[PDB]
Design a protein around this ligand. Structure first.
Ligand SMILES: [Cl-]
Ligand SMILES: [Cl-]
Ligand code: NA
Length: 129
């Protein structure tokens, strides 16, 4: 599913991401925009053989099992394919574990490089939330 900007903002808010660990909703929408272009089916392979999955591009080296990342952990205890659903629940629940592990949203490279320190509230402007 390719989410609209306000549609995704509303779904993220319903799933408890607004101000989760101090990150306002706009940070999460901005991160999703630049990680996946709001596409739940996005996948991208990394140089170490791991793959990033879903709207928030969660990495198989640590967070999910895709059966093809040797020596990897599955800290969210999910198959990576669950992160590609039109239902963002699995992605949100796993993102909450990631953002809580000490490094905050810096775990998302696109957030650090394209959202951090910008007016992220612009990403939810005009939305009925
Ligand atoms: Cl915001
Ligand atoms: Cl933080
Ligand atoms: Na894994």
């Amino acid at each position: 599913k390719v989410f609209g900007r306000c549609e995704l903002a509303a779904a993220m808010k319903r799933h408890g991401l607004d101000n989760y660990r101090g990150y306002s909703l706009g940070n999460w929408v901005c991160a999703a925009k630049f990680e996946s272009n709001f596409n739940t089916q996005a996948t991208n392979r990394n140089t170490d053989g791991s793959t990033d999955y879903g709207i928030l591009q969660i990495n198989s080296r640590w967070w999910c099992n895709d059966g093809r990342t040797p020596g990897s952990r599955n800290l969210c205890n999910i198959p990576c394919s669950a992160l590609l659903s039109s239902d963002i629940t699995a992605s949100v629940n796993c993102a909450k574990k990631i953002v809580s592990d000490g490094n905050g949203m810096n775990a998302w490279v696109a957030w650090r490089n394209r959202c951090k320190g910008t007016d992220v509230q612009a990403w939810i402007r005009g939305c009925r939330l």
